[PDB]
Each structure stands twice: as structure tokens, then as C-alpha cells.
Amino acid sequence: CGGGFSCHDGETCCPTSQTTWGCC
């Protein structure tokens, strides 16, 4: 995914919030 945050290779994109998302 490519919302509006950064992450490390290997991590998965999952829903963390209602308006914003995050990694797992």
C-alpha cells in the first residue's frame, strides 16, 4: 500500500485505524 506513512520491507499493510491505516 501507499497511504501516507513509511514501513520496513517484509511488513504487511493492515487496517490500524478507521481513517488511517498501518502495518502489521
PDB file of all heavy atoms in Angstrom:
ATOM      1  N   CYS A   1       0.827  -1.201   0.000  1.00  0.00           N
ATOM      2  CA  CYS A   1       0.000   0.000   0.000  1.00  0.00           C
ATOM      3  C   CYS A   1       0.866   1.257   0.000  1.00  0.00           C
ATOM      4  O   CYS A   1       2.082   1.185   0.170  1.00  0.00           O
ATOM      5  CB  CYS A   1      -0.928   0.006   1.217  1.00  0.00           C
ATOM      6  SG  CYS A   1      -0.066   0.219   2.807  1.00  0.00           S
ATOM      7  N   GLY A   2       0.229   2.407  -0.192  1.00  0.00           N
ATOM      8  CA  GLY A   2       0.956   3.664  -0.210  1.00  0.00           C
ATOM      9  C   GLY A   2       0.113   4.829   0.270  1.00  0.00           C
ATOM     10  O   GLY A   2      -0.057   5.817  -0.443  1.00  0.00           O
ATOM     11  N   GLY A   3      -0.419   4.712   1.483  1.00  0.00           N
ATOM     12  CA  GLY A   3      -1.244   5.771   2.036  1.00  0.00           C
ATOM     13  C   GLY A   3      -0.455   7.035   2.314  1.00  0.00           C
ATOM     14  O   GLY A   3      -0.268   7.866   1.425  1.00  0.00           O
ATOM     15  N   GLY A   4       0.006   7.183   3.552  1.00  0.00           N
ATOM     16  CA  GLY A   4       0.771   8.360   3.923  1.00  0.00           C
ATOM     17  C   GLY A   4       1.744   8.086   5.052  1.00  0.00           C
ATOM     18  O   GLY A   4       1.934   8.923   5.934  1.00  0.00           O
ATOM     19  N   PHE A   5       2.362   6.910   5.027  1.00  0.00           N
ATOM     20  CA  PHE A   5       3.319   6.527   6.058  1.00  0.00           C
ATOM     21  C   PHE A   5       4.420   5.644   5.478  1.00  0.00           C
ATOM     22  O   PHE A   5       4.356   5.235   4.318  1.00  0.00           O
ATOM     23  CB  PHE A   5       2.608   5.793   7.197  1.00  0.00           C
ATOM     24  CG  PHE A   5       1.811   4.605   6.739  1.00  0.00           C
ATOM     25  CD1 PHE A   5       2.378   3.341   6.712  1.00  0.00           C
ATOM     26  CD2 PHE A   5       0.494   4.753   6.334  1.00  0.00           C
ATOM     27  CE1 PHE A   5       1.647   2.247   6.291  1.00  0.00           C
ATOM     28  CE2 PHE A   5      -0.243   3.661   5.911  1.00  0.00           C
ATOM     29  CZ  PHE A   5       0.335   2.407   5.890  1.00  0.00           C
ATOM     30  N   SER A   6       5.429   5.353   6.293  1.00  0.00           N
ATOM     31  CA  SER A   6       6.546   4.522   5.859  1.00  0.00           C
ATOM     32  C   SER A   6       6.631   3.249   6.695  1.00  0.00           C
ATOM     33  O   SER A   6       6.165   3.206   7.834  1.00  0.00           O
ATOM     34  CB  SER A   6       7.858   5.302   5.962  1.00  0.00           C
ATOM     35  OG  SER A   6       7.878   6.389   5.054  1.00  0.00           O
ATOM     36  N   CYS A   7       7.231   2.211   6.121  1.00  0.00           N
ATOM     37  CA  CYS A   7       7.379   0.935   6.811  1.00  0.00           C
ATOM     38  C   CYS A   7       8.644   0.213   6.354  1.00  0.00           C
ATOM     39  O   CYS A   7       9.359   0.689   5.472  1.00  0.00           O
ATOM     40  CB  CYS A   7       6.155   0.052   6.560  1.00  0.00           C
ATOM     41  SG  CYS A   7       4.903   0.123   7.881  1.00  0.00           S
ATOM     42  N   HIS A   8       8.912  -0.940   6.960  1.00  0.00           N
ATOM     43  CA  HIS A   8      10.089  -1.728   6.615  1.00  0.00           C
ATOM     44  C   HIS A   8       9.712  -2.902   5.715  1.00  0.00           C
ATOM     45  O   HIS A   8       8.644  -3.494   5.866  1.00  0.00           O
ATOM     46  CB  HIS A   8      10.774  -2.241   7.881  1.00  0.00           C
ATOM     47  CG  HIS A   8      11.282  -1.149   8.772  1.00  0.00           C
ATOM     48  ND1 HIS A   8      11.996  -1.390   9.927  1.00  0.00           N
ATOM     49  CD2 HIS A   8      11.177   0.197   8.670  1.00  0.00           C
ATOM     50  CE1 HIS A   8      12.306  -0.240  10.499  1.00  0.00           C
ATOM     51  NE2 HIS A   8      11.822   0.738   9.756  1.00  0.00           N
ATOM     52  N   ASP A   9      10.597  -3.232   4.780  1.00  0.00           N
ATOM     53  CA  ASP A   9      10.357  -4.334   3.856  1.00  0.00           C
ATOM     54  C   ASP A   9      10.023  -5.616   4.614  1.00  0.00           C
ATOM     55  O   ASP A   9      10.701  -5.974   5.577  1.00  0.00           O
ATOM     56  CB  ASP A   9      11.581  -4.558   2.966  1.00  0.00           C
ATOM     57  CG  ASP A   9      11.813  -3.411   2.002  1.00  0.00           C
ATOM     58  OD1 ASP A   9      12.024  -2.273   2.472  1.00  0.00           O
ATOM     59  OD2 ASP A   9      11.785  -3.652   0.778  1.00  0.00           O
ATOM     60  N   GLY A  10       8.973  -6.301   4.174  1.00  0.00           N
ATOM     61  CA  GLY A  10       8.567  -7.534   4.823  1.00  0.00           C
ATOM     62  C   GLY A  10       7.269  -7.383   5.593  1.00  0.00           C
ATOM     63  O   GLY A  10       6.535  -8.354   5.777  1.00  0.00           O
ATOM     64  N   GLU A  11       6.987  -6.165   6.043  1.00  0.00           N
ATOM     65  CA  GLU A  11       5.770  -5.893   6.798  1.00  0.00           C
ATOM     66  C   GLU A  11       4.555  -5.853   5.877  1.00  0.00           C
ATOM     67  O   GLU A  11       4.667  -5.524   4.696  1.00  0.00           O
ATOM     68  CB  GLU A  11       5.897  -4.567   7.551  1.00  0.00           C
ATOM     69  CG  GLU A  11       6.492  -4.710   8.941  1.00  0.00           C
ATOM     70  CD  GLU A  11       7.802  -5.475   8.939  1.00  0.00           C
ATOM     71  OE1 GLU A  11       8.840  -4.874   8.595  1.00  0.00           O
ATOM     72  OE2 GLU A  11       7.787  -6.676   9.283  1.00  0.00           O
ATOM     73  N   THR A  12       3.392  -6.193   6.425  1.00  0.00           N
ATOM     74  CA  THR A  12       2.156  -6.198   5.654  1.00  0.00           C
ATOM     75  C   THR A  12       1.296  -4.983   5.984  1.00  0.00           C
ATOM     76  O   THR A  12       1.347  -4.457   7.095  1.00  0.00           O
ATOM     77  CB  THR A  12       1.337  -7.477   5.915  1.00  0.00           C
ATOM     78  OG1 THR A  12       2.216  -8.580   6.161  1.00  0.00           O
ATOM     79  CG2 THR A  12       0.438  -7.795   4.729  1.00  0.00           C
ATOM     80  N   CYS A  13       0.507  -4.542   5.010  1.00  0.00           N
ATOM     81  CA  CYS A  13      -0.365  -3.389   5.197  1.00  0.00           C
ATOM     82  C   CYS A  13      -1.737  -3.819   5.706  1.00  0.00           C
ATOM     83  O   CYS A  13      -2.499  -4.473   4.993  1.00  0.00           O
ATOM     84  CB  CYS A  13      -0.515  -2.618   3.883  1.00  0.00           C
ATOM     85  SG  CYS A  13      -1.178  -0.934   4.080  1.00  0.00           S
ATOM     86  N   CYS A  14      -2.046  -3.449   6.944  1.00  0.00           N
ATOM     87  CA  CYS A  14      -3.325  -3.797   7.550  1.00  0.00           C
ATOM     88  C   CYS A  14      -3.984  -2.568   8.173  1.00  0.00           C
ATOM     89  O   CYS A  14      -3.325  -1.586   8.514  1.00  0.00           O
ATOM     90  CB  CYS A  14      -3.132  -4.879   8.614  1.00  0.00           C
ATOM     91  SG  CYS A  14      -1.725  -4.581   9.731  1.00  0.00           S
ATOM     92  N   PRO A  15      -5.315  -2.624   8.324  1.00  0.00           N
ATOM     93  CA  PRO A  15      -6.092  -1.526   8.907  1.00  0.00           C
ATOM     94  C   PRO A  15      -5.830  -1.359  10.400  1.00  0.00           C
ATOM     95  O   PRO A  15      -6.138  -2.245  11.199  1.00  0.00           O
ATOM     96  CB  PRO A  15      -7.543  -1.949   8.663  1.00  0.00           C
ATOM     97  CG  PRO A  15      -7.492  -3.435   8.564  1.00  0.00           C
ATOM     98  CD  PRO A  15      -6.165  -3.764   7.940  1.00  0.00           C
ATOM     99  N   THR A  16      -5.261  -0.217  10.773  1.00  0.00           N
ATOM    100  CA  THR A  16      -4.956   0.066  12.170  1.00  0.00           C
ATOM    101  C   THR A  16      -5.994   1.003  12.779  1.00  0.00           C
ATOM    102  O   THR A  16      -6.352   0.870  13.949  1.00  0.00           O
ATOM    103  CB  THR A  16      -3.559   0.695  12.324  1.00  0.00           C
ATOM    104  OG1 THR A  16      -3.401   1.772  11.394  1.00  0.00           O
ATOM    105  CG2 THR A  16      -2.471  -0.343  12.096  1.00  0.00           C
ATOM    106  N   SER A  17      -6.471   1.949  11.978  1.00  0.00           N
ATOM    107  CA  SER A  17      -7.465   2.911  12.440  1.00  0.00           C
ATOM    108  C   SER A  17      -8.670   2.939  11.505  1.00  0.00           C
ATOM    109  O   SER A  17      -8.756   2.152  10.562  1.00  0.00           O
ATOM    110  CB  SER A  17      -6.848   4.308  12.537  1.00  0.00           C
ATOM    111  OG  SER A  17      -5.472   4.236  12.862  1.00  0.00           O
ATOM    112  N   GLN A  18      -9.599   3.852  11.772  1.00  0.00           N
ATOM    113  CA  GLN A  18     -10.800   3.982  10.955  1.00  0.00           C
ATOM    114  C   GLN A  18     -10.547   4.892   9.758  1.00  0.00           C
ATOM    115  O   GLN A  18     -11.064   4.657   8.665  1.00  0.00           O
ATOM    116  CB  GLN A  18     -11.956   4.531  11.793  1.00  0.00           C
ATOM    117  CG  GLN A  18     -12.289   3.675  13.003  1.00  0.00           C
ATOM    118  CD  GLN A  18     -11.448   4.025  14.216  1.00  0.00           C
ATOM    119  OE1 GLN A  18     -11.653   5.061  14.850  1.00  0.00           O
ATOM    120  NE2 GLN A  18     -10.495   3.160  14.545  1.00  0.00           N
ATOM    121  N   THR A  19      -9.749   5.934   9.971  1.00  0.00           N
ATOM    122  CA  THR A  19      -9.429   6.881   8.910  1.00  0.00           C
ATOM    123  C   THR A  19      -8.043   6.612   8.332  1.00  0.00           C
ATOM    124  O   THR A  19      -7.820   6.764   7.131  1.00  0.00           O
ATOM    125  CB  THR A  19      -9.488   8.334   9.417  1.00  0.00           C
ATOM    126  OG1 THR A  19      -8.537   8.524  10.470  1.00  0.00           O
ATOM    127  CG2 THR A  19     -10.883   8.676   9.919  1.00  0.00           C
ATOM    128  N   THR A  20      -7.116   6.210   9.195  1.00  0.00           N
ATOM    129  CA  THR A  20      -5.751   5.920   8.770  1.00  0.00           C
ATOM    130  C   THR A  20      -5.426   4.442   8.939  1.00  0.00           C
ATOM    131  O   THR A  20      -6.025   3.755   9.767  1.00  0.00           O
ATOM    132  CB  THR A  20      -4.728   6.754   9.564  1.00  0.00           C
ATOM    133  OG1 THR A  20      -4.750   6.373  10.944  1.00  0.00           O
ATOM    134  CG2 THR A  20      -5.025   8.240   9.437  1.00  0.00           C
ATOM    135  N   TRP A  21      -4.473   3.957   8.151  1.00  0.00           N
ATOM    136  CA  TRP A  21      -4.068   2.557   8.215  1.00  0.00           C
ATOM    137  C   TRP A  21      -2.640   2.427   8.735  1.00  0.00           C
ATOM    138  O   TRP A  21      -1.988   3.424   9.039  1.00  0.00           O
ATOM    139  CB  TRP A  21      -4.182   1.908   6.834  1.00  0.00           C
ATOM    140  CG  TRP A  21      -5.567   1.434   6.514  1.00  0.00           C
ATOM    141  CD1 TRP A  21      -6.742   2.029   6.872  1.00  0.00           C
ATOM    142  CD2 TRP A  21      -5.920   0.261   5.770  1.00  0.00           C
ATOM    143  NE1 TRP A  21      -7.804   1.299   6.398  1.00  0.00           N
ATOM    144  CE2 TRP A  21      -7.327   0.210   5.718  1.00  0.00           C
ATOM    145  CE3 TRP A  21      -5.185  -0.749   5.143  1.00  0.00           C
ATOM    146  CZ2 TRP A  21      -8.009  -0.812   5.064  1.00  0.00           C
ATOM    147  CZ3 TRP A  21      -5.865  -1.762   4.496  1.00  0.00           C
ATOM    148  CH2 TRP A  21      -7.265  -1.788   4.459  1.00  0.00           C
ATOM    149  N   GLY A  22      -2.162   1.191   8.835  1.00  0.00           N
ATOM    150  CA  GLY A  22      -0.814   0.954   9.318  1.00  0.00           C
ATOM    151  C   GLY A  22      -0.266  -0.388   8.875  1.00  0.00           C
ATOM    152  O   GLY A  22      -0.825  -1.033   7.987  1.00  0.00           O
ATOM    153  N   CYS A  23       0.832  -0.811   9.492  1.00  0.00           N
ATOM    154  CA  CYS A  23       1.458  -2.083   9.156  1.00  0.00           C
ATOM    155  C   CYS A  23       1.205  -3.120  10.247  1.00  0.00           C
ATOM    156  O   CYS A  23       0.691  -2.797  11.318  1.00  0.00           O
ATOM    157  CB  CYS A  23       2.962  -1.898   8.953  1.00  0.00           C
ATOM    158  SG  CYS A  23       3.409  -1.112   7.371  1.00  0.00           S
ATOM    159  N   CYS A  24       1.568  -4.367   9.967  1.00  0.00           N
ATOM    160  CA  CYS A  24       1.380  -5.451  10.923  1.00  0.00           C
ATOM    161  C   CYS A  24       2.724  -6.032  11.356  1.00  0.00           C
ATOM    162  O   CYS A  24       3.375  -6.750  10.597  1.00  0.00           O
ATOM    163  CB  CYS A  24       0.510  -6.552  10.312  1.00  0.00           C
ATOM    164  SG  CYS A  24      -1.275  -6.333  10.602  1.00  0.00           S
TER     165      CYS A  24
END
